Amino acid sequence: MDQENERNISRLWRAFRTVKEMVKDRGYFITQEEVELPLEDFKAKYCDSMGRPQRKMMSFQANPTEESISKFPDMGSLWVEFCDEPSVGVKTMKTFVIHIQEKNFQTGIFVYQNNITPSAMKLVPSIPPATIETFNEAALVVNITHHELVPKHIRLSSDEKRELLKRYRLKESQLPRIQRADPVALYLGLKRGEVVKIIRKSETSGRYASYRICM
Amino acid sequence: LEPGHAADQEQAKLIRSAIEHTTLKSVTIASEIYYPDIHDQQSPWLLRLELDRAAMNDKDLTMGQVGERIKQTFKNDLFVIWSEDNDEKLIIRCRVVRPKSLDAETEAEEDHMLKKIENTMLENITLRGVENIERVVMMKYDRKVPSPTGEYVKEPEWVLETDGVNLSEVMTVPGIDPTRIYTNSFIDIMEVLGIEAGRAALYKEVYNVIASDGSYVNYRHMALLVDVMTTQGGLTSVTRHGFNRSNTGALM
Amino acid sequence: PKDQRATTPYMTKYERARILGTRALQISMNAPVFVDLEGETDPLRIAMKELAEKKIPLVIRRYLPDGSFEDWSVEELIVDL
Amino acid sequence: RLVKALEDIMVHYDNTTRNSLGNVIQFIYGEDGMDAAHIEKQSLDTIGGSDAAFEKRYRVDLLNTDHTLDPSLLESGSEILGDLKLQVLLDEEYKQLVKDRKFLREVFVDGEANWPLPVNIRRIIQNAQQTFHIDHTKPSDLTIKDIVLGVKDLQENLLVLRGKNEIIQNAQRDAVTLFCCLLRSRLATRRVLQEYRLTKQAFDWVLSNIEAQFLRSVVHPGEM
DNA sequence: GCTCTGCTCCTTCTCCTTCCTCTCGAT
DNA sequence: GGAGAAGGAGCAGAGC
RNA sequence: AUCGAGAGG
Numbered sequence A: 001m002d003q004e005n006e007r008n009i010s011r012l013w014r015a016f017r018t019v020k021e022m023v024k025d026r027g028y029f030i031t032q033e034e035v036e037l038p039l040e041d042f043k044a045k046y047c048d049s050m051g052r053p054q055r056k057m058m059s060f061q062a063n064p065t066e067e068s069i070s071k072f073p074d075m076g077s078l079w080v081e082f083c084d085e086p087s088v089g090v091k092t093m094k095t096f097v098i099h100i101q102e103k104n105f106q107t108g109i110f111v112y113q114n115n116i117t118p119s120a121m122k123l124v125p126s127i128p129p130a131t132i133e134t135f136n137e138a139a140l141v142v143n144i145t146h147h148e149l150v151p152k153h154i155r156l157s158s159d160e161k162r163e164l165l166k167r168y169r170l171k172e173s174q175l176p177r178i179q180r181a182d183p184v185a186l187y188l189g190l191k192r193g194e195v196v197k198i199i200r201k202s203e204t205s206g207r208y209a210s211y212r213i214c215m
Numbered sequence B: 001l002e003p004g005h006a007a008d009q010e011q012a013k014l015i016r017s018a019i020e021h022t023t024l025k026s027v028t029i030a031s032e033i034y035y036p037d038i039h040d041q042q043s044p045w046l047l048r049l050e051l052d053r054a055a056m057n058d059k060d061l062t063m064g065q066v067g068e069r070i071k072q073t074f075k076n077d078l079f080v081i082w083s084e085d086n087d088e089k090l091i092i093r094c095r096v097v098r099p100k101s102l103d104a105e106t107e108a109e110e111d112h113m114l115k116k117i118e119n120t121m122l123e124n125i126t127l128r129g130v131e132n133i134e135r136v137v138m139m140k141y142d143r144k145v146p147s148p149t150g151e152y153v154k155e156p157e158w159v160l161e162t163d164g165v166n167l168s169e170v171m172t173v174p175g176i177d178p179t180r181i182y183t184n185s186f187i188d189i190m191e192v193l194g195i196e197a198g199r200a201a202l203y204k205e206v207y208n209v210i211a212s213d214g215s216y217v218n219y220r221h222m223a224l225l226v227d228v229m230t231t232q233g234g235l236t237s238v239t240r241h242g243f244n245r246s247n248t249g250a251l252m
Numbered sequence C: 001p002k003d004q005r006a007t008t009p010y011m012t013k014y015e016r017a018r019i020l021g022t023r024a025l026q027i028s029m030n031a032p033v034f035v036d037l038e039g040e041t042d043p044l045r046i047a048m049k050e051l052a053e054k055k056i057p058l059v060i061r062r063y064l065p066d067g068s069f070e071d072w073s074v075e076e077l078i079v080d081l
Numbered sequence D: 001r002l003v004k005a006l007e008d009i010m011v012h013y014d015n016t017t018r019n020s021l022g023n024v025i026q027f028i029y030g031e032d033g034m035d036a037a038h039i040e041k042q043s044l045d046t047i048g049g050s051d052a053a054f055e056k057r058y059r060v061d062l063l064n065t066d067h068t069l070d071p072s073l074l075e076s077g078s079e080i081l082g083d084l085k086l087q088v089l090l091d092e093e094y095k096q097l098v099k100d101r102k103f104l105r106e107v108f109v110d111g112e113a114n115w116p117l118p119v120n121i122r123r124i125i126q127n128a129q130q131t132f133h134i135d136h137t138k139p140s141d142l143t144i145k146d147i148v149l150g151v152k153d154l155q156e157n158l159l160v161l162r163g164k165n166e167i168i169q170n171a172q173r174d175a176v177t178l179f180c181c182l183l184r185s186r187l188a189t190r191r192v193l194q195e196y197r198l199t200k201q202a203f204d205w206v207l208s209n210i211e212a213q214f215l216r217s218v219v220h221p222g223e224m
Numbered sequence E: 001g002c003t004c005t006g007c008t009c010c011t012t013c014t015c016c017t018t019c020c021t022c023t024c025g026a027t
Numbered sequence F: 001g002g003a004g005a006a007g008g009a010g011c012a013g014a015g016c
Numbered sequence G: 001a002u003c004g005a006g007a008g009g
Helices: A007-025 A039-046 A066-071 A090-103 A158-167 A183-188 B009-019 B053-058 B063-074 B111-122 B186-193 B195-211 B219-228 C013-028 C043-052 D051-058 D084-107 D121-131 D144-156 D166-175 D177-186 D189-195 D200-217
Strands: A060-062 A078-082 A107-112 A131-136 A152-155 A195-201 A207-214 B028-034 B046-051 B078-082 B090-096 B126-128 B136-146 B152-162 C059-063 C069-073 D024-026 D039-043 D114-118
Touching (some): A007 A078, A007 A183, A158 D166, A183 B186, A195 B195, B009 B136, B009 B152, B028 B111, B046 B053, B046 B111, B063 B078, B063 B111, B063 B126, B090 B111, B195 B219, C013 C043, D039 D121, D114 D177, D121 D177, D121 D200, D144 D189
Antiparallel strands (some): A152 A195, B078 B090, B136 B152, C059 C069
């Protein structure tokens, strides 16, 4: 939409908020008021005086909480940045990649404005052990984990996973599976082999925990 | 609808206009090309588009509104002038723009170009609404709401039952509660929300089918079925491309 | 293991059915009966009496998904049902 | 097709539903571990009703006349008056019952109170009322402490899983959440002392009867 | 700048099945 | 009848 | 022994 038609900006604002929620859920130190930023405040802080959401300014650094660290000792820092250019080309992808390499971020999130080329996509997983996750602003407009049909997903530690498999005499292949491309798996940033505890409300018992492993 | 507008049919109307997909064609009467039409950007060709006023009234469309959409899709490649909304004939006249020659001349442009414009226009001008969404039925539905006394009291709310599915865009519509939207497609609810949402919805639809004839099957049996179909993180059918494509014993 | 048996202490309807069937078979094969035959000639009825008195000399090997198992004796199992 | 697709799904001795490959379908069969044949539709009284009505039916306050029990209900009903120690137990009970409303309102957002749950407790109570000739004109020998702790003890002795690992113990706590909600809502102090004026013998009998039937409702391993 | 090296985006093709029971009447 | 599997084709980018 | 047809449930 037009700069006049701020709807576009508000969609961006929504996406911004959902990113803050996602990052928070990922275990990074995000405050509640940080998440709950008003549209007019978003505009005041990020939107250019000419009504032009300064997308570049929406980038930020996230740092795992003490609790998150104690549960996931190897959890490093996160860099989040939104693409200023509608279509993501490798010239901008590499720029992002470089930022991570120079700052030594453990992981980074790169958000598409409109779309992305294969020239960039192939670069996204070229800097082990660092992991780059990507999302589209449109996809980020609504945080799907608040939907009534989506239950609480808890990313388990390697110790919790080990104990789980031992307890039920299970092999990894005997757990219920979730694809790494699954909206929620993407939201959590699950890596192959990670197990998620899912707590649902039921009709036969109050609630029921279920485990599912990332493929 | 967003809770606050649950009892606001005018908001429901606003949303219906925001979702109900409208293609220019649906509100037009006829299109003619001419060589007492109403104000580089000038050709001798007069693309006469006659709009259906009654339809536009029904869809709350103005010629200016339509025109802005036309300009958005044709940019400055097509010169368009609109009649007034109070005119008896809602005529839109288009002329070809061409700085390469029309800059200082009224050279006749190729009819094929106009034919391309006709199709590009008539068949693709998405005036308003969400793609693939057709009919939008506005009706009140009842729902028990724990009152201020603590006891559930049945309340009415406006719900928009649409024809077609497109969660990817509908969920982002302003004034809509994105957490309550529900479809019939397992594939789409899965791809949009995830396998747990897909599985949950899968159950709900299996339930609806059985319940539709008044019969009753224990939750426990239906739950088992849909759980099995979703153990792989996707939707496994009961066919030879579902069940038989497994790692289970060959003799089975 | 002997202890730390995680399976129920009750006898299931499937365990009961097979216990009675296999014991009744032995009885029909003229095996020694460990309870008084109070006019009882029907192997099954005889077996049910032994079940009630926990005289049936059997052990149930309960196999667990991973191939391991827990051994429970008839006397240990609670014949409720 | 359905029979073939689900041909090999069975409840194992670990109470987990699995296929031939040993893949877990349901960690607890049916999300409760109980046989459908032993399930009956019962009413979860605390889901419905106004908050005021709930309070009237479940709040007991021995320190205030607004909700103090009528002395005549108990042989020692005049002694419990002002008994803060019992009030603590009563506060515990009520608090939990309030939490139950919160919880069940979240679980069943449509307010439906009639759900299929194992063990028709209502009928069990009626059996006690008749079996022991419960004279409703006579004060009972029930003690508030005994009622509160008696019900809590029952909850602890329900069982479904029998492992020791916290994983299993947690699963056990979750497996019987609704049934325990039913027990608590059905056997509250006022429910036991005013509506179902049972004797100590009858009350104890009810609890032991519920236990036995509950255990019988649990699905057997080997079940197809 | 212009062909090139990939795609991914389409159109255009091969494959499968209540239960169960009875009789006759042909090869 | 409605899949699925195999194949030809038609363009964004990209290196010389 | 196959093969088709007529029925029954």
